[PDB]
Amino acid sequence: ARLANKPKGTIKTIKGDDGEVVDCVDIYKQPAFDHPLLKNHTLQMQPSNKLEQPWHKNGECPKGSIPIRRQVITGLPVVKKQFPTNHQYAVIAYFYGNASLQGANATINIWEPNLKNPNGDFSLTQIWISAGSGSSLNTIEAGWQVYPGRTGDSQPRFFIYWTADGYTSTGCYDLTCPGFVQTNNYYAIGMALQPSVYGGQQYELNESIQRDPATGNWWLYLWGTVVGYWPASIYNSITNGADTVEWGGEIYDSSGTGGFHTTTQMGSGHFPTEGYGKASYVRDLQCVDTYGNVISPTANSFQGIAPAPNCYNYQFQQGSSELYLFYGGPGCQAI
Ligand SMILES: *[C@@H]1O[C@H](CO)[C@@H](O[C@@H]2O[C@H](CO)[C@@H](O)[C@H](O)[C@H]2NC(C)=O)[C@H](O)[C@H]1NC(C)=O
Numbered sequence: 005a006r007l008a009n010k011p012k013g014t015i016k017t018i019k020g021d022d023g024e025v026v027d028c029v030d031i032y033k034q035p036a037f038d039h040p041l042l043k044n045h046t047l048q049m050q051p052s053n054k055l056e057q058p059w060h061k062n063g064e065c066p067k068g069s070i071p072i073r074r075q076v077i078t079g080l081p082v083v084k085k086q087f088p089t090n091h092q093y094a095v096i097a098y099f100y101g102n103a104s105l106q107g108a109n110a111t112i113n114i115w116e117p118n119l120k121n122p123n124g125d126f127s128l129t130q131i132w133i134s135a136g137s138g139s140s141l142n143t144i145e146a147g148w149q150v151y152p153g154r155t156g157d158s159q160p161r162f163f164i165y166w167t168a169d170g171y172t173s174t175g176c177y178d179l180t181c182p183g184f185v186q187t188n189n190y191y192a193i194g195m196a197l198q199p200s201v202y203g204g205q206q207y208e209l210n211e212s213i214q215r216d217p218a219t220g221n222w223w224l225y226l227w228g229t230v231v232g233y234w235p236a237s238i239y240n241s242i243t244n245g246a247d248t249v250e251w252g253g254e255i256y257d258s259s260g261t262g263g264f265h266t267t268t269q270m271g272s273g274h275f276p277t278e279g280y281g282k283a284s285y286v287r288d289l290q291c292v293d294t295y296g297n298v299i300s301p302t303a304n305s306f307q308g309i310a311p312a313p314n315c316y317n318y319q320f321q322q323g324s325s326e327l328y329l330f331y332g333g334p335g336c337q338a339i
């Protein structure tokens with residue numbers, strides 16, 4: 005494992021005790037401003053405990069800068085992002101009739117699923133917010149991922165993603181390409197999250213994505229705090245709202261069994277029927293309509309996507325104040 009070079013505009017570099025490196029980059033020289041479509045530079049400074057990270061022990065970024073995690077170059081290939089082959093899913097999808105949804109929430113249970121082939125596999129849980137299809141598919145993505153080939157280790161790490169052309173030539177993870185504009189001075193994207201304990205303490209990643217009606221910029225909130233936004237100018241299909249929201253798990257099987265014969269885990273590595281504390285969940289399954297109303301779709305309003313149900317699957321758990329989606333599994337033992 006090697007560290008990438010400092011990005012331009014770095015005013016200070018902070019080294020964490022565990023080997024993490026953070027570059028405090030001038031908020032006006034952050035990668036987003038190198039995007040050809042973001043020549044309209046006007047930085048929307050603001051929309052019209054859980055975010056504190058351990059690296060703060062060794063320093064803070066000065067005012068006017070943002071913390072950017074230093075990329076780790078492992079020498080291993082990072083596979084192309086794919087909409088819900090060696091990818092497997094346990095996902096639910098809410099399909100609106102037109103691209104007018106103004107936001108969506110996801111409160112995702114955090115785990116450290118085990119990978120059978122850690123140098124090539126990944127396991128994630130996220131939200132997908134999208135509009136359009138094929139070459140005009142636009143996405144807004146946030147969740148946690150275990151991907152040693154990309155991140156350098158096996159911890160679940162917060163990530164963002166986007167594309168404006170169905171992953172053909174636009175988009176990337178976190179701030180590794182120009183796109184997402186970060187406004188938050190203390191929260192670095194790409195850092196580890198605390199995993200839940202089987203039969204014990206549960207940890208959650210609350211994320212809320214909201215389109216600003218005045219600018220069209222899509223703001224990201226983590227546990228109610230602003231992180232930054234996906235500018236409307238990098239998109240086409242989703243500039244006025246989204247037509248689809250999906251939630252759930254995904255694995256990538258580098259062993260080539262199509263995700264049908266690997267014990268790489270999704271969620272907690274336990275099937276949904278094990279329930280709270282044992283199987284991973286997604287709650288706050290909510291979206292926002294054009295009038296600003298929060299929609300909480302019922303279980304029968306979603307389409308399920310679970311192509312290897314003997315390995316990874318999902319189950320709704322109803323009867324509580326809100327719908328829970330339990331998802332994931334241990335995978336299927338190799339034959
Ligand atoms: C669920 O989504 C709603 C709608 O976006 C969120 O509510 C908004 O929260 C922002 C601040 O984060 C306020 O400016 C808006 O006025 C709120 N709107 C409404 C209708 O309440 C809500 O915070 C999200 N909840 C969770 C748990 O993520």
Ligand SMILES: *[C@@H]1O[C@H](CO[C@@H]2O[C@@H](C)[C@@H](O)[C@@H](O)[C@@H]2O)[C@@H](O)[C@H](O)[C@H]1NC(C)=O
Pocket residue numbers: 099100101102104
């Ligand atoms: C835009 O779409 C709105 C929502 O669509 C309806 O509800 C979703 C959940 C799907 O089941 C979809 O098939 C339904 O049609 C409509 O309420 C609204 O009228 C639409 N707006 C216009 C101008 O057509």
